[PDB]
Design a protein around this ligand. Structure first.
Ligand SMILES: CC1CCN(c2ccnc(NCCc3ccccc3)n2)CC1
Length: 590
């Protein structure tokens, strides 16, 4: 059955299916977007017959090939019309990017050499959609970035804001310097791949550290050299700046200057974006001037980034009106999820939710700040893509499952299990939390409650927990050895080990609850203690960083259930046999 991510604006399925044609005639192969034609030719290995076979027509509005279907093509940037029936196939973009988007949709329809009969009219609700490379921690590799960009094109994200922290040429002081040949050629390769995948490579300059005519000049000259390298989209960051540099009139002046002498002078600049000094409502001064002045003086064609009501927050109608009213334009949203650079011992693999689905007209852009774990971030990235394309049809849970099935088809259920219990951030200085382990929350609560007050627990809840731990160990072991996405596995390995140990500990603790005799109980107790020690070992030796070192997993519901069940059963044991076992859950070498 027809599943499409992102879901099209309009879709009609006929409940018939046609074969991908053995023999086809291609119309418009020459005048249509070469990137789209390339995908189409990839999917086709029947024979191009010049006078026979099923017509396939590909083109942008105004091409000869799609003249007949012009009224069906949506009048929206990046829009397209796609049609499949017995007679013919139509892939008609409103523009070149739209034709490519058609083809991305077409590739998802094609299953086992068969196509549904369908008619689609489609376009994005939000103008700019993608990823800002905006996390602290170990930068992504070159290969990681190439793989991201291909994923962005598949999910119709048109925006990549480049900024690896190990590249000094977009930061102080080296922003003034041209890229040396080797680095330039690498960035060049990113640009080429971004272009092939219809993604805007947005080169971000971060000069905030370092206001005269000559600084203005050097920036403009640098922008020019990045143009020669093939860059067509640009961002200027002021999150960074202090003192005089925080003056919004002077920020506007430089940006309006860049617009006039560079962006308006070139034939083909797409995005010009700035990040303001006050970038969320919490960190702005209600008693000050900065956002209204920016909104007044900054040219209308320049985007202003915004994180919402707080630095980590989900965007609401009230939030978006607050900012738009000040900047006098639709805010370009920077969403600080799934970035984990302030909770580095946690993976954030849960669904994308919380953003208001009715406000697409009030946002110019929506970009996600991801984790230092590139592959792992694809779960949220795919979901963001889906949300930003079609927010009205956004389905958090189905999109989450679809992302997981896309990223790891050979072990989707196992990754779902792992991801379900690795979602929450735990307590943190931003107060931002996510749900986790919702499937077993009721079983866990009722189990604890009963076990607490020396009332009997339900056998079914015991079994649910038992089943959960068994499933976690199966999932951990299958994921560790999975070779379909080795980079993914490499990223999560430390947590997978910790997650397996958590499950083993849970099983041992359940055996203490059933405790048949004193000797068996003591065996399980000693095993639990040794497993706690291994978890500390991993916590002390993996993922070491100055900020949140180590590895935490299943922290919201599962680990606390195990900890409390352990402390309770040990206290019961101590009372019964008049013993003095340590009931604590965090072992300690001192
Ligand atoms: C638009 C702005 C740009 C700068 N921001 C970054 C940059 C990198 N990482 C993150 N991680 C989020 C937690 C956090 C960390 C440091 C400072 C504040 C909030 N935020 C905040 C958003």
């Amino acid at each position: 059955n027809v599943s499409l991510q992102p879901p099209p604006q309009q879709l009609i399925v006929q409940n018939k299916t046609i074969d991908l044609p053995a023999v086809y005639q291609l119309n418009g192969g020459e005048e249509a977007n070469p990137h789209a034609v390339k995908v189409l030719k990839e999917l086709l290995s029947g024979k191009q017959s010049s006078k026979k076979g099923m017509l396939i027509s590909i083109g942008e509005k105004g091409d000869k090939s799609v003249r007949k279907y012009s009224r069906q093509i949506p009048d929206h940037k990046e829009g397209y019309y796609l049609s499949v029936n017995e007679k013919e196939i139509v892939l008609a973009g409103n523009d070149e990017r739209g034709t490519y988007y058609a083809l991305q949709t077409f590739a998802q329809l094609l299953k086992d050499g068969k196509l549904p009969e369908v008619e689609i009219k489609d376009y994005p609700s939000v103008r700019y959609r993608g990823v800002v490379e905006g996390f602290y921690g170990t930068p992504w590799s070159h290969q990681a970035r190439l793989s991201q960009l291909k994923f962005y094109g598949k999910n119709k994200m048109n925006t990549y804001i480049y900024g690896p922290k190990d590249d000094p040429y977009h930061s102080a002081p080296n922003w003034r310097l041209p890229y040396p040949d080797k680095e330039a050629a690498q960035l060049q390769e990113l640009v080429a791949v971004a272009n092939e995948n219809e993604v805007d490579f947005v080169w971000a300059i971060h000069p905030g550290q370092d206001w005269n005519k000559e600084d203005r000049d050097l920036l403009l000259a640098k922008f020019e050299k990045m143009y020669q390298l093939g860059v067509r989209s640009f961002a200027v960051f002021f999150d960074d700046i202090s003192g005089e540099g925080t003056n919004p009139q002077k920020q506007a002046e430089l940006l309006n200057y860049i617009d006039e002498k560079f962006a308006q002078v070139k034939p083909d600049i797409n995005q010009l974006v700035m990040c303001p000094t006050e970038y969320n409502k919490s960190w702005s001064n209600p008693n000050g001037n900065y956002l209204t002045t920016l909104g007044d003086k900054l040219n209308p064609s320049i985007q202003i980034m915004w994180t919402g009501d707080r630095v980590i927050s989900d965007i609401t109608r009230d939030g978006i009106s607050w900012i738009n009213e000040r900047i006098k334009r639709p805010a370009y949203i920077w969403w600080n999820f799934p970035v984990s650079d302030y909770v580095r011992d946690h993976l954030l693999l849960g669904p994308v939710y919380g953003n208001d689905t009715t406000i697409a007209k009030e946002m110019s852009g929506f970009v996600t700040n991801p984790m230092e774990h590139a592959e792992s971030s694809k779960i949220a990235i795919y979901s963001v893509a889906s949300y930003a394309w079609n927010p009205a049809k956004y389905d958090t849970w189905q999109t989450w499952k679809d992302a997981i099935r896309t990223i790891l088809p050979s072990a989707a259920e196992e990754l779902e299990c792992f991801a379900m219990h690795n979602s929450d951030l735990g307590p943190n200085g931003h107060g931002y939390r996510r749900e986790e382990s919702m499937d077993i929350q009721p079983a866990a609560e009722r189990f604890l409650k009963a076990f607490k007050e020396g009332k009997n627990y339900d056998k079914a809840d015991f079994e649910t927990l038992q089943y959960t731990f068994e499933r976690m160990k199966e999932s951990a072991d299958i994921l560790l050895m999975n070779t379909e996405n080795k980079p993914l596995i490499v990223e999560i390995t430390p947590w997978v080990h910790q997650f397996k140990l958590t499950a083993e500990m849970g099983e041992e603790v359940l055996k203490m609850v059933e405790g048949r005799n004193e000797s068996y109980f003591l065996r399980k107790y000693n095993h639990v203690k040794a497993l706690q020690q291994q978890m500390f070992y991993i916590d002390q030796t993996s993922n070491q960083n100055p900020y949140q070192p180590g590895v935490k997993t299943a922290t919201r519901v599962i680990k606390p259930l195990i900890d409390r069940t352990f402390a309770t059963v040990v206290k019961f044991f101590n009372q019964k046999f008049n013993a003095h076992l340590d009931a604590t859950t965090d072992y300690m070498p001192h």
